[PDB]
Design an enzyme around this catalytic site. Structure first.
Site, PDB file in Angstrom:
ATOM      1  N   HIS A  53       1.641   9.182   0.997  1.00 22.49           N
ATOM      2  CA  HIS A  53       0.654   8.988  -0.067  1.00 22.49           C
ATOM      3  C   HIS A  53       1.008   9.904  -1.231  1.00 22.49           C
ATOM      4  O   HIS A  53       1.440  11.014  -1.027  1.00 22.49           O
ATOM      5  CB  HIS A  53      -0.748   9.266   0.389  1.00 22.49           C
ATOM      6  CG  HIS A  53      -1.102   8.587   1.671  1.00 22.49           C
ATOM      7  ND1 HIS A  53      -1.833   7.410   1.685  1.00 22.49           N
ATOM      8  CD2 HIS A  53      -0.759   8.853   2.956  1.00 22.49           C
ATOM      9  CE1 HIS A  53      -1.991   7.034   2.957  1.00 22.49           C
ATOM     10  NE2 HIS A  53      -1.281   7.858   3.704  1.00 22.49           N
ATOM     11  N   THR A  59      -6.643   6.740   7.420  1.00 25.45           N
ATOM     12  CA  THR A  59      -7.115   6.902   6.054  1.00 25.45           C
ATOM     13  C   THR A  59      -7.043   5.651   5.227  1.00 25.45           C
ATOM     14  O   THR A  59      -7.356   5.735   4.054  1.00 25.45           O
ATOM     15  CB  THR A  59      -6.379   8.008   5.360  1.00 25.45           C
ATOM     16  OG1 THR A  59      -5.007   7.581   5.267  1.00 25.45           O
ATOM     17  CG2 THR A  59      -6.526   9.365   6.095  1.00 25.45           C
ATOM     18  N   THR A  60      -6.649   4.549   5.824  1.00 21.33           N
ATOM     19  CA  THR A  60      -6.743   3.213   5.192  1.00 21.33           C
ATOM     20  C   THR A  60      -7.507   2.325   6.144  1.00 21.33           C
ATOM     21  O   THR A  60      -7.573   2.524   7.369  1.00 21.33           O
ATOM     22  CB  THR A  60      -5.396   2.602   4.941  1.00 21.33           C
ATOM     23  OG1 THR A  60      -4.739   2.282   6.169  1.00 21.33           O
ATOM     24  CG2 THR A  60      -4.508   3.476   4.102  1.00 21.33           C
ATOM     25  N   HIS A  67       2.831  11.276   6.448  1.00 22.88           N
ATOM     26  CA  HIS A  67       2.165  11.007   7.726  1.00 22.88           C
ATOM     27  C   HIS A  67       3.150  10.438   8.686  1.00 22.88           C
ATOM     28  O   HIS A  67       3.651   9.326   8.464  1.00 22.88           O
ATOM     29  CB  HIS A  67       1.059  10.001   7.470  1.00 22.88           C
ATOM     30  CG  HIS A  67      -0.078  10.573   6.716  1.00 22.88           C
ATOM     31  ND1 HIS A  67      -1.025   9.780   6.088  1.00 22.88           N
ATOM     32  CD2 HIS A  67      -0.415  11.848   6.467  1.00 22.88           C
ATOM     33  CE1 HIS A  67      -1.895  10.576   5.481  1.00 22.88           C
ATOM     34  NE2 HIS A  67      -1.562  11.834   5.718  1.00 22.88           N
ATOM     35  N   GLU A  76      -3.872  13.433   0.479  1.00 26.80           N
ATOM     36  CA  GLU A  76      -5.176  12.957   1.030  1.00 26.80           C
ATOM     37  C   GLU A  76      -5.975  14.145   1.566  1.00 26.80           C
ATOM     38  O   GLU A  76      -7.040  14.451   1.035  1.00 26.80           O
ATOM     39  CB  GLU A  76      -4.862  11.992   2.184  1.00 26.80           C
ATOM     40  CG  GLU A  76      -4.146  10.753   1.655  1.00 26.80           C
ATOM     41  CD  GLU A  76      -4.392   9.547   2.451  1.00 26.80           C
ATOM     42  OE1 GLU A  76      -4.077   9.517   3.663  1.00 26.80           O
ATOM     43  OE2 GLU A  76      -4.952   8.556   1.852  1.00 26.80           O
ATOM     44  N   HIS A  92       0.873  -1.226   0.000  1.00 29.45           N
ATOM     45  CA  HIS A  92       0.000   0.000   0.000  1.00 29.45           C
ATOM     46  C   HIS A  92       0.879   1.236   0.000  1.00 29.45           C
ATOM     47  O   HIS A  92       0.563   2.213  -0.691  1.00 29.45           O
ATOM     48  CB  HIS A  92      -0.964   0.043   1.256  1.00 29.45           C
ATOM     49  CG  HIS A  92      -1.669  -1.257   1.499  1.00 29.45           C
ATOM     50  ND1 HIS A  92      -2.638  -1.732   0.632  1.00 29.45           N
ATOM     51  CD2 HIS A  92      -1.605  -2.136   2.512  1.00 29.45           C
ATOM     52  CE1 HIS A  92      -3.134  -2.864   1.088  1.00 29.45           C
ATOM     53  NE2 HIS A  92      -2.519  -3.146   2.208  1.00 29.45           N
ATOM     54  N   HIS A 132       5.064   7.263   6.658  1.00 27.18           N
ATOM     55  CA  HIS A 132       4.856   6.851   5.272  1.00 27.18           C
ATOM     56  C   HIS A 132       4.282   8.003   4.494  1.00 27.18           C
ATOM     57  O   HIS A 132       4.034   9.056   5.071  1.00 27.18           O
ATOM     58  CB  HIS A 132       3.915   5.665   5.201  1.00 27.18           C
ATOM     59  CG  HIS A 132       2.558   5.971   5.743  1.00 27.18           C
ATOM     60  ND1 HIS A 132       2.250   5.825   7.068  1.00 27.18           N
ATOM     61  CD2 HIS A 132       1.480   6.598   5.193  1.00 27.18           C
ATOM     62  CE1 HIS A 132       1.053   6.282   7.320  1.00 27.18           C
ATOM     63  NE2 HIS A 132       0.564   6.783   6.199  1.00 27.18           N
TER      64      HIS A 132
HETATM   65  O1  LIG Z   1      -8.081  -2.744  16.544  1.00 22.48           O
HETATM   66  C1  LIG Z   1      -6.848  -2.938  16.794  1.00 22.48           C
HETATM   67  O2  LIG Z   1      -6.251  -3.023  17.929  1.00 22.48           O
HETATM   68  C2  LIG Z   1      -5.919  -3.087  15.581  1.00 22.48           C
HETATM   69  C3  LIG Z   1      -5.957  -2.059  14.706  1.00 22.48           C
HETATM   70  C4  LIG Z   1      -5.151  -1.958  13.474  1.00 22.48           C
HETATM   71  C5  LIG Z   1      -4.880  -3.085  12.734  1.00 22.48           C
HETATM   72  C6  LIG Z   1      -4.135  -2.992  11.576  1.00 22.48           C
HETATM   73  C7  LIG Z   1      -3.645  -1.778  11.139  1.00 22.48           C
HETATM   74  C8  LIG Z   1      -3.926  -0.653  11.875  1.00 22.48           C
HETATM   75  O3  LIG Z   1      -3.487   0.584  11.503  1.00 22.48           O
HETATM   76  C9  LIG Z   1      -2.742   0.585  10.258  1.00 22.48           C
HETATM   77  C10 LIG Z   1      -2.359   2.021   9.988  1.00 22.48           C
HETATM   78  C11 LIG Z   1      -1.335   2.624  10.687  1.00 22.48           C
HETATM   79  C12 LIG Z   1      -1.030   3.931  10.421  1.00 22.48           C
HETATM   80  C13 LIG Z   1      -1.703   4.682   9.493  1.00 22.48           C
HETATM   81  C14 LIG Z   1      -2.730   4.116   8.788  1.00 22.48           C
HETATM   82  C15 LIG Z   1      -3.475   4.954   7.770  1.00 22.48           C
HETATM   83  C16 LIG Z   1      -2.566   5.760   6.806  1.00 22.48           C
HETATM   84  O4  LIG Z   1      -2.169   5.155   5.776  1.00 22.48           O
HETATM   85  O5  LIG Z   1      -2.301   6.976   7.105  1.00 22.48           O
HETATM   86  C17 LIG Z   1      -3.030   2.790   9.052  1.00 22.48           C
HETATM   87  C18 LIG Z   1      -4.675  -0.736  13.028  1.00 22.48           C
HETATM   88 ZN   LIG Z   2      -1.157   7.762   5.738  1.00 19.61          ZN
END
Ligand SMILES: O=C(O)/C=C/c1cccc(OCc2cccc(CC(=O)O)c2)c1
Ligand SMILES: [Zn+2]
EC number: 4.2.1.1
Length: 258
Positions: free
Chosen positions: A94, A196-197, A117, A104, A62, A92
């Protein structure tokens, strides 16, 4: 879960596996600069990255994540809208297929070429997985990228991207200093939102800096040579890994500046 950014698995599909996609505090949003209100009560923002310990860079299919040691209070974010101490866990980006899109968040509907981010978790919850179950569990520092002059502090990142082209590849990434990714000003907007994912959890205090950083066309071009696919699979370039702006609903975006 096979979510992604394509026509068949992209943001318009996410709500079927992740119904909170249509929730009340989804991110990103458009930042309307004329509607955001200066908030004099915001305390000053403290970015304390002197002791940051980077470990590894990972292509997760991703984006690519630069991961930090968060087993102690090395690199933390405090102040601004935040109560308490938030530990850096990863950053990371986007980005777009073209320089006219990629971010985003938008600013008066303006899309930037990319968005960084820096993800932090509230240390009162003990670990990241517990923090994402709380409405104040994360603080994400968002930084826009525009194409212009090269950002020197980014070059170590772009030079390693050839070694993690495909999904599941990682490389050692020690001694990287995230201070080199910041703009001069820490003026920001803030609002409550989400990841955002997927899983799109509503656990984020967003802090979006007003000043974008400049990166070179060569730098961002190298982002766009990554792959969403794994090794030995048909090539799908890693571009346009951004979710579009979501409904603001019952939220106010506050400005730290006049
Ligand atoms: O419910 C739980 O304890 C597990 C949750 C969980 C489980 C898996 C993953 C996750 O987050 C992935 C993540 C981290 C940082 C940023 C983003 C969004 C972005 O791309 O900005 C997503 C959270
Ligand atoms: Zn992000």
């Amino acid at each position: 879960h096979h979510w992604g950014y394509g026509k068949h698995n992209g943001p318009e599909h996410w709500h079927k596996d992740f119904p909170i996609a249509k929730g009340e505090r989804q991110s990103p949003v458009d930042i309307d600069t004329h509607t955001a209100k200066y908030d004099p009560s915001l305390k000053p923002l403290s970015v304390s990255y002197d002791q940051a310990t980077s470990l590894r860079i990972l292509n997760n299919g991703h984006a690519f994540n630069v991961e930090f040691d968060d087993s102690q209070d090395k690199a933390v974010l405090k102040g601004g809208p935040l109560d308490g101490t938030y530990r850096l866990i990863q950053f990371h980006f986007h980005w777009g297929s073209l320089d006219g899109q990629g971010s985003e968040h938008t600013v008066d509907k303006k899309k930037y070429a990319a968005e960084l981010h820096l993800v932090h978790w509230n240390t009162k919850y003990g670990d990241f997985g517990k923090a994402v179950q709380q409405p104040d569990g994360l603080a994400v520092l968002g930084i826009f990228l525009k194409v212009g002059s090269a950002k020197p502090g980014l070059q170590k990142v772009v030079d390693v991207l050839d070694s993690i082209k495909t999904k599941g590849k990682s490389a050692d990434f020690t001694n990287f200093d995230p201070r080199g990714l910041l703009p001069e000003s820490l003026d920001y907007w803030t609002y409550p939102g989400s990841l955002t994912t997927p899983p799109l959890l509503e656990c984020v205090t967003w802090i979006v800096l007003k000043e974008p950083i400049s990166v070179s066309s060569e730098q961002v071009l190298k982002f766009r040579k990554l792959n969403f696919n794994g090794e030995g699979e048909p090539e799908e370039l890693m571009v346009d890994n951004w979710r579009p702006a979501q409904p603001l609903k019952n939220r106010q975006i506050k400005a730290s500046f006049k």
